[PDB]
Structures are given as structure tokens and as C-alpha cells.
Amino acid sequence: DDNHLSIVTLEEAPFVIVEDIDTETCVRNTVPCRKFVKINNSTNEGMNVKKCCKGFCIDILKKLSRTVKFTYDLYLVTNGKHGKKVNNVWNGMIGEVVYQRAVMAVGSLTINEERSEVVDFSVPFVETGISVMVSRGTQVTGLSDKKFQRPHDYSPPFRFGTVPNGSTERNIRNNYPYMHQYMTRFNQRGVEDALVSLKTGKLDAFIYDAAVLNYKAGRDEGCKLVTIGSGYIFATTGYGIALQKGSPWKRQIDLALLQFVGDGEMEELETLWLTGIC
Amino acid sequence: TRLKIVTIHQEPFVYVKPTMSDGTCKEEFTVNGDPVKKVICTGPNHTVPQCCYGFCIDLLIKLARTMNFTYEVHLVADGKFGTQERVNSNKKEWNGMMGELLSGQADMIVAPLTINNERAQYIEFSKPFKYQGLTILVKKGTRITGINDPRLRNPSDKFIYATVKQSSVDIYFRRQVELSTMYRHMEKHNYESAAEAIQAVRDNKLHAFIWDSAVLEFEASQKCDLVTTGELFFRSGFGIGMRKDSPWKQNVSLSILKSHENGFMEDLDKTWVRYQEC
Numbered sequence: 001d002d003n004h005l006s007i008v009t010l011e012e013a014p015f016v017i018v019e020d021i022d023t024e025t026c027v028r029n030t031v032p033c034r035k036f037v038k039i040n041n042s043t044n045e046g047m048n049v050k051k052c053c054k055g056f057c058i059d060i061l062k063k064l065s066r067t068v069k070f071t072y073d074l075y076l077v078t079n080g081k082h083g084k085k086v087n088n089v090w091n092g093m094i095g096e097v098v099y100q101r102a103v104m105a106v107g108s109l110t111i112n113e114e115r116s117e118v119v120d121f122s123v124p125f126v127e128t129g130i131s132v133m134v135s136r137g138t139q140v141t142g143l144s145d146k147k148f149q150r151p152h153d154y155s156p157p158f159r160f161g162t163v164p165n166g167s168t169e170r171n172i173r174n175n176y177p178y179m180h181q182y183m184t185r186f187n188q189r190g191v192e193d194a195l196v197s198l199k200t201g202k203l204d205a206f207i208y209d210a211a212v213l214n215y216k217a218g219r220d221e222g223c224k225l226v227t228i229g230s231g232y233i234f235a236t237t238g239y240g241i242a243l244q245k246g247s248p249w250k251r252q253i254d255l256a257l258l259q260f261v262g263d264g265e266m267e268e269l270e271t272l273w274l275t276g277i278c
Numbered sequence: 279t280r281l282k283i284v285t286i287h288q289e290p291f292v293y294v295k296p297t298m299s300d301g302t303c304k305e306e307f308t309v310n311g312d313p314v315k316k317v318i319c320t321g322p323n324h325t326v327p328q329c330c331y332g333f334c335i336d337l338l339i340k341l342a343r344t345m346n347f348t349y350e351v352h353l354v355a356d357g358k359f360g361t362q363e364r365v366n367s368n369k370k371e372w373n374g375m376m377g378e379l380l381s382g383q384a385d386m387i388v389a390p391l392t393i394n395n396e397r398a399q400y401i402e403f404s405k406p407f408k409y410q411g412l413t414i415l416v417k418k419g420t421r422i423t424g425i426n427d428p429r430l431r432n433p434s435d436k437f438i439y440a441t442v443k444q445s446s447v448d449i450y451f452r453r454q455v456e457l458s459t460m461y462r463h464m465e466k467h468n469y470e471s472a473a474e475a476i477q478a479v480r481d482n483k484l485h486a487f488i489w490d491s492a493v494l495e496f497e498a499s500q501k502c503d504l505v506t507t508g509e510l511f512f513r514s515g516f517g518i519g520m521r522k523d524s525p526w527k528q529n530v531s532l533s534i535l536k537s538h539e540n541g542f543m544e545d546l547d548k549t550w551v552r553y554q555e556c
């Protein structure tokens with residue numbers, strides 16, 4: 001009915017963590033979420049499978065459901081991740097919302113201009129942007145540091161990279177063309193490989209999503225890996241809930257999220273799921 | 279399409295200076311060689327024309343150019359940001375910039391206006407143009423751990439702390455019953471404006487000033503007898519304020535997002551907000 005909402009999310013620890021069902025039911029702090037699971041890699045055939053979801057974003061969804069008073073059917077997106085426009089068709093979580101298969105999307109979904117043209121976003125509930133991680137001792141400010149913009153002006157020249165084909169690289173390509181060209185030979189397969197490169201001295205700085213880097217710094221064995229101060233984050237933005245354009249839920253979601261922030265409940269979820277021992 | 283803009287004195291976001299004898303604004307460049315864009319802003323001195331510039335004025339000019347509107351700028355008559363108060367009773371009314379926007383004396387608030395639940399109930403905020411938070415300013419040599427210091431949590435008149443009257447910080451301490459003891463202390467001491475509270479810290483008449491970190495860090499970098507303590511104890515953002523029926527809403531928010539993404543906000547923060555540690 002009008003009060004029961006189709007909601008899409010995406011597996012991405014610690015924001016959304018997916019587990020197998022028990023007892024046939026989802027217990028503890030988990031909620032039901034289903035996934036359309038493909039038969040094989042060469043077909044559109046598949047089967048809906050019952051799962052259990054928990055995490056930072058799931059706790060947010062639970063709070064919203066209680067406060068704003070809606071019920072939901074939660075599913076995991078299967079085509080894409082967060083959302084990219086391919087052949088002028090949106091995939092991922094963004095696509096589910098744009099094409100009306102979900103009323104909202106909840107997850108580590110970054111707010112930007114391109115997506116905002118096709119969905120409405122709640123207020124940000126987690127701050128992010130483009131940040132920089134280094135091993136303690138290494139001296140840089142944020143992305144706009146001349147040491148990044150003109151590495152050859154310094155000795156030795158800085159070695160720094162990102163993960164290819166994501167939003168950080170895309171932003172750098174648009175804003176700092178020489179820096180982008182310079183970084184290509186230092187780019188990293190993924191976040192894990194980047195952390196090793198830093199720790200083993202093969203890389204001086206790793207440039208990436210701020211929330212991800214803060215999470216990683218929080219749990220670095222030895223607590224030697226650190227991020228720049230939040231004052232230096234470039235292109236500051238946030239993760240937010242995506243709703244359909246003109247959605248009748250947006251005001252209520254927004255007010256609830258700001259109440260949560262105001263009452264310190266947001267700081268509590270961050271301490272629970274995001275803040276590490278470092 | 280001629281917008282009445284309301285704003286407020288609040289360095290480094292808004293500087294207010296006398297006009298020249300002929301009623302124009304003195305041509306000036308920033309320390310880095312950028313032209314300082316100045317607009318005539320009328321405000322209380324009775325009402326007189328004055329010159330305004332700074333982070334928020336640059337943002338206004340970019341907005342006005344991108345969305346093709348014209349504007350006249352004035353400084354809020356009561357000099358406050360805005361809280362909601364009981365009148366005499368029954369009715370509640372907003373004061374400050376919030377009141378002017380709601381009554382139609384302004385069509386848009388362009389100022390370091392904190393986004394919170396209380397205000398979002400009645401007006402529309404853009405996505406944040408600045409992410410920051412709350413911190414505490416003291417005279418160098420003053421020792422407090424921060425917001426949970428026993429001299430804050432268990433107040434007496436031996437250690438005086440305050441914020442600005444009728445601001446988001448006032449709202450923050452008033453909204454939580456567990457903060458009622460702190461609030462009872464602060465209301466006895468709250469200042470009319472940020473500048474006066476800051477001066478009072480320098481003069482040793484106020485021992486701790488609780489306020490926006492985007493402002494307090496700038497002040498501590500200009501005035502080395504002042505320091506901030508405890509990092510951020512709360513995170514919040516500034517946004518453009520409009521009435522709920524504004525036709526400009528969507529495009530203002532898109533413009534802000536775009537400006538974070540293309541380095542425009544980075545430029546503004548470097549021109550106005552960024553600072554060398556003492």
C-alpha cells in the first residue's frame with residue numbers, strides 16, 4: 001500500500017553488510033533484504049533469494065522507518081553499484097530510483113550534481129569528499145597542494161595515486177589535468193592494495209573518498225596511516241538518501257535526518273560502525 | 279527576478295566596511311592578487327549604504343550570474359541569525375535573518391547560516407555550501423579539554439562561557455534537557471554578536487566562546503593570543519536559505535554542488551577561510 005515502500009540498497013561493509021538467513025528469519029540487528037541472484041554469467045535468468053542486512057545505513061533506515069512511520073521491502077541492487085550513466089541509461093541504485101523500481105535508495109551513495117539532475121537527495125548524513133591518506137610523518141595538505149599539482153617542482157617528486165575508473169579519478173581528470181596524467185603510473189587496483197603500498201613505502205599518498213579513508217585510518221594496525229584534516233577535503237559533499245524527483249517523502253526524511261544529527265544519534269551510529277580504535 | 283538578499287556581518291564570510299566619500303566601494307585586491315568583489319549593502323549604522331564582500335558575497339555573485347537574477351543586499355536589522363521565540367503567548371515568531379526571510383523583507387539568506395531541524399521546518403535550505411562544526415575559543419593559556427570539561431559541565435561564575443544570542447548555537451544548547459544546566463549558565467552571558475564575544479575573550483571578560491569552527495579557526499589564525507580547543511564537538515553545515523515556494527531552490531542547490539565539484543569552493547576557501555597556523 002501507500003505506506004509500504006520499495007527500497008534499494010547495495011552491499012558495502014560497514015555501511016551495508018549482507019548475511020545469510022538463519023530459523024528462516026532475520027534476527028539481532030539485521031533486517032530482511034532480498035537479492036535477485038543470477039543463474040550464471042551469460043543470462044538474464046535468476047532467482048530471488050532471501051538475505052539479512054545490517055550496518056550503518058541499515059540502522060539509519062530503521063530509525064527513519066520508526067520516525068517517519070513507513071514500512072519497507074528492501075532489496076539489493078544487481079545491475080551496477082551506486083549508479084553510473086551508461087549509454088544515457090542510469091544503472092545501479094540511482095537507476096532503480098530513476099526508473100521507479102525503488103522509492104528510495106539507502107547506502108554509501110555520494111551526492112553530486114549529475115545525479116541530482118535525475119533524483120532528489122536528502123540532506124547529507126555522512127560527510128565525504130576527496131581526501132588524502134599518508135603514512136604519519138609525510139607532509140601534504142589536500143588535493144590542491146602544489147606538491148600534487150606540480151610534483152616536479154619538488155625533490156624527491158611525490159608518488160601518489162588513486163583507484164582508476166572511479167569518481168576521484170574522474171574529478172581529478174576534470175580539475176587538474178597534469179596531476180591526473182602524472183598519477184596514472186601510480187594508480188592502485190583497490191583500496192587494500194593502496195594501504196599496503198603506503199605501509200611498504202612504495203607510495204607516499206593515496207587520494208580517495210574521505211569517508212572510506214577515515215574508516216580505514218581508524219582501523220590501521222599500528223595506527224600509522226592518517227588522513228589530512230577535514231578542513232582540507234576537496235569537493236566536500238555527503239552520502240545521502242536518493243528519492244524520486246518530487247517525492248512526497250523527501251521533507252519528512254530530511255527533517256528526521258536533521259533531528260537525528262541534532263540529538264547526537266548520528267554521532268552514536270558513527271561510533272558504533274565507522275569509528276575505529278585509532 | 280530582483281531578489282532582496284539578507285546577510286549579516288561575520289568575517290571571513292561577510293566583511294562590512296564604510297563606503298568612500300562618494301558612496302562607492304574602494305577597489306582592492308586580495309593578498310593573492312584577486313580582485314575583491316564588493317557590493318553595496320544597506321544596514322543599521324538609522325539605515326546607511328555600506329560595502330560588503332567576502333566568501334558569501336563571492337558565492338552570491340556566482341549564483342546571480344549562473345541563474346541570471348539581480349539583487350539588492352541588506353544587513354539584517356536586528357543583527358541576529360534567527361531563533362523562534364514565544365510572543366508575549368500562543369504565537370511563535372522568528373527573529374534575525376530567519377524572520378526577515380519569512381516575513382518577505384528578504385527573498386534569500388546568503389550568510390553562514392547553520393542548517394538545522396528547527397529552521398528547516400519553515401524554510402528551504404540549499405545543500406551545504408560549507409561543511410564545518412562547533413568548537414570552543416579561549417585565550418591561550420586557558421586550559422579546558424572541551425565541551426565535557428567539568429568547568430563547562432558543572433558551571434559557576436568563576437569560569438564564564440557563552441555563545442551568540444539568537445543563533446543556532448543557542449538553539450543547540452536549548453533543545454536538549456540534559457544541557458539545561460549549561461544553558462542556564464550561558465543565557466546569563468550570551469553576547470549580541472560573534473565579534474563582541476571574541477573581543478571579550480581577548481579582554482578576559484569571557485573565558486570561553488562556543489561558536490562555528492569556520493569562524494573561530496579563522497580568528498585564532500589572525501589573533502595568536504586566541505586558540506581553539508577540543509576540535510569539533512558537533513558537525514554542521516551552512517546553506518543558502520529560501521522560502522519554501524522559491525522557484526530558485528533547485529538551481530541554487532545544483533549550482534552549489536557544481537561549485538564544490540569544479541574547484542570554485544576550493545578557491546573561495548583559499549581566498550577567505552584558509553589560514554596559517556600560529
Ligand SMILES: O=C(O)[C@@H]1[C@H](C(=O)O)NCCN1C(=O)c1ccc2c(ccc3ccccc32)c1
Pocket residue numbers: 012013014082083108109110111166167168191192209212215
Ligand atoms: O563516490 C564514490 O566514489 C563511490 C560511491 C558512489 O556514490 O558512487 N560513494 C562512496 C564511495 N564510492 C565507492 O565506490 C567505494 C569504494 C571503496 C569502499 C567503499 C565503501 C567501503 C569500503 C570499505 C573498505 C574498502 C573500500 C571501501 C565505497
